[PDB]
Amino acid sequence: IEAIKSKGKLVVALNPDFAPFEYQKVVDGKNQIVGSDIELAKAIATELGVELELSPMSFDNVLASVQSGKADLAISGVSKTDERSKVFDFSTPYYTAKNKLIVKKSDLATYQSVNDLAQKKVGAQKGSIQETMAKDLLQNSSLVSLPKNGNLITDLKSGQVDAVIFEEPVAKGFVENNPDLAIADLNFEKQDDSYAVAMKKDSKELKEAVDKTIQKLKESGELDKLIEDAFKASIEK
């Protein structure tokens, strides 16, 4: 936190292809990075009395950038995991999600359970816990792991993959803008998937500032409003 205050800016790593949390929106003819995680980042920077600097990158590189010191925080829809918790400090959680499949709409009732994915092609984002889930459970499937979420959506449209695994709000956001797609019936037989801010190990005072901010936004209902606003603003008109 002292290094951050002294340098006058907070550098946040994120991958802006993940509405409602972070995404690109055309504003006045130019793409701008927006979303509920950007509003969370702004609140943290305000708490610390510093400027906010975004560092957009592929999701696969977000955590590594925090680990090496190239960014101060990852605020990028990052799930806590035991493996990650060994290497990173995490904030208190700020969102909890279920995993879903997005499919072509004619396939929404084909996929009920994981067994229905046998002999099918399933995509997930490279570096995500969804990619890990697919690798660990779907031995009878062909797995595609792509750096960019938009490219997973393109592959699902071209019928190059049969399904893509995404957390529910993100899946819903893509369906809003793609009426050729739908959320499948499938559920996974559920540990917690909770989003948190990642930071370097042993950053106690930075964690305090982040957690004070999350606590405030939760108790006021503001965080809920931010996610809803961002979801609405991600729908293309």
Ligand X SMILES: NC(=[NH2+])NCCC[C@H](N)C(=O)O
Tokens of 78: 């990052």
* CA nearest neighbour of 41 among 98, 91, 99: 91
Rounded (10°) CA dihedral 97, 130, 57, 146: -140
1 vs 21, beta carbon nearer ligand X: 21
Least Cβ distance, residue 205 to ligand X (angstroms): 24
Query: Following CA atoms 155, 191, 141, 15 in sequence, which dihedral angle do they give, to the nearest 10 degrees?
Result: 20
Assigned token pair, 185: 């019936």
Give a three-class secondary structure readout of 117-148: HCCCEEEEECCCHHHHHHHHHCCCCEEEEECC
| Residues of this chain, 148-167, that bind ligand X according to CB under 6 A | 167
Q: Which does residue 124 bind out of ligand X, Cl ion, none, counting CB within 5 to 8 angstroms by kind? A: none
The only residue of 61, 151, 194, 215 in contact with Cl ion, by rule CB under 5 A = 151
Instruction: Please identify, among the stretches 9-17, 24-32, 150-158, 211-219, the one whose residues bind ligand X according to the rule CB under 6 A.
Output: 9-17
Per-residue binder mask for ligand X (CB under 6 A), 40-69, x = binder: -------------------x----------
Cβ atoms of 180 and 104 closer than 8 Å: yes
Partner touching 36 among Cl ion, ligand X, none, CB below 5 to 8 Å by kind: none
105/121 with CB nearer Cl ion: 121
Choose among Cl ion, ligand X, none what residue 15 binds, the Cβ cut-off being 5 to 8 Å by kind. ligand X
**79 contacts ligand X (rule: CB under 6 A):** yes
The one among 146, 186, 199, 214 contacting Cl ion by CB under 5 A: 146
Q: Which stretch binds ligand X (CB under 6 A): 13-21, 45-53, 100-108, 150-158?
A: 13-21
Q: What is the CB neighbour count within 10 angstroms for residue 200?
A: 16
234 near ligand X, judged by CB under 6 A: no
Task: Tell me whether strands 51-56 and 9-14 are parallel, antiparallel or unpaired.
Answer: parallel
Give the C-alpha distances (Å, rounded to integers) separating 214 from 74, 91, 113, 189, 231: 14, 8, 35, 29, 19
**Binding status of residue 77 toward ligand X by CB under 6 A:** yes
Interface contacts to Cl ion, rule CB under 5 A: 1, 146-148, 151, 203, 205-206
Binding site for ligand X (CB under 6 A): 14-15, 17-18, 22, 59, 76-79, 125, 128-129, 167
